[PDB]
Amino acid sequence: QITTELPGRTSAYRIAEVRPQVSGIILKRNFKEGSDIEAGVSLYQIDPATYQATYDSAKGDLAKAQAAANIAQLTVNRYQKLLGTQYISKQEYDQALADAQQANAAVTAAKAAVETARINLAYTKVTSPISGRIGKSNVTEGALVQNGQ
Amino acid sequence: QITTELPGRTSAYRIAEVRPQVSGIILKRNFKEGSDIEAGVSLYQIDPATYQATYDSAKGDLAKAQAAANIAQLTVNRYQKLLGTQYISKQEYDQALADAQQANAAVTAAKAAVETARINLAYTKVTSPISGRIGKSNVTEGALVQNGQATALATVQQLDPIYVDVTQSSNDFLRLKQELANGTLKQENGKAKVSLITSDGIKFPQDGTLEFSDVTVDQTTGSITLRAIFPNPDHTLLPGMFVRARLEEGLNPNAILVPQQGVTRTPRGDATVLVVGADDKVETRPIVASQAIGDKWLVTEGLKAGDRVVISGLQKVRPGVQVKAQEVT
Amino acid sequence: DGIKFPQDGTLEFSDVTVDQTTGSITLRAIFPNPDHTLLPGMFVRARLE
Amino acid sequence: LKVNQDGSRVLLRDVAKIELGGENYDIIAEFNGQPASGLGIKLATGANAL
Measured between CB atoms, which of C1, C39, C43 is closest to B215?
A: C39
Instruction: Answer for the pair B204, B195: CB distance below 8 angstroms, yes or no.
Output: yes
Chain C CB contacts of A10 under 8 Å are 38-42, 44
Alpha helices in A2-145 (DSSP H): 49-82, 90-123
**Distance in angstroms (rounded) separating the CA atoms of residues A42 and A127:** 4
Cα(A8)–Cα(C27) distance, rounded to whole angstroms?
9
The DSSP result for B79-110, as a single string, is HHHHGGGT-S-HHHHHHHHHHHHHHHHHHHHH
**Alpha helices, DSSP H, located in chain B:** 49-82, 90-124, 170-181
Residues of A with CB below 8 A from B113's CB? 53, 57
Q: Which of residues 64-93 of B touch A (CB under 8 A)?
A: 91
* Cα distance between residue A71 and residue B100, in whole Å: 12
Number of H helices and number of E strands within chain A? 2, 6
Structure solved using which method? cryo-EM
Contact: B221, D20; criterion CB under 8 Å: no
Distance from CA of A42 to the nearest CA of C (A): 25
Chain A nearest-CA residue for C28: A8
Assess contact for B7 and B223: CB atoms under 8 A. Answer: no
What one-letter code names the amino acid at A133?
A: R
- Which residue among A4, A7, A11 sits closest to C40, beta carbon to beta carbon? A11
3-state secondary structure of A137: coil
A5 touches A113 (CB < 8 A): no
Contact B207, B193 (CB under 8 A): yes
Residues of chain C neighbouring B222 (CB-CB closer than 8 A): 42-43
C-alpha to C-alpha distance for B171 and D16, rounded to whole angstroms:
15
- C42–chain B Cβ distance below 8 A for any pair: yes
| DSSP letter, residue B212 | E
Type of residue numbered A98: A
Query: Measured between CB atoms, does B220 come within 8 Å of chain C?
Result: no
> In the 8-state DSSP scheme, what is residue B288?
B
A35 touches C: beta carbon within 8 Å: no
Q: Please tell me which residue of chain B has the smallest CA distance to D11.
A: B221
- Using CA atoms, how far apart are residues A81 and B138, in angstroms rounded to an integer? 75
Residue closest to B127 by CA, chosen among B50, B20, B228, B35 = B20
Q: For residue C27, what are the contacts with CB-CB under 8 A and spacing of at least 6? A: A6, C11, C13, C14, C15, C48
Our measurement of the distance from residue A146's CA atom to the centroid of its chain's CA atoms, rounded to an integer in Å, reads 19
**Residue C39 sits at the chain B interface (C-beta within 8 Å):** yes
Beta bridge partners of residue B248, listed in sequence order: B3
The resolution of the experimental structure, rounded to one decimal in Å, is 3.4
Q: Going along B142-207, which residue ranges are E strands?
A: 144-145, 154-169, 193-197
Q: How far is B259 from chain D (nearest CA, A)?
A: 25
| Phi, psi at B325, each rounded to 5° | -105, 130
A42 DSSP 8-state letter: B
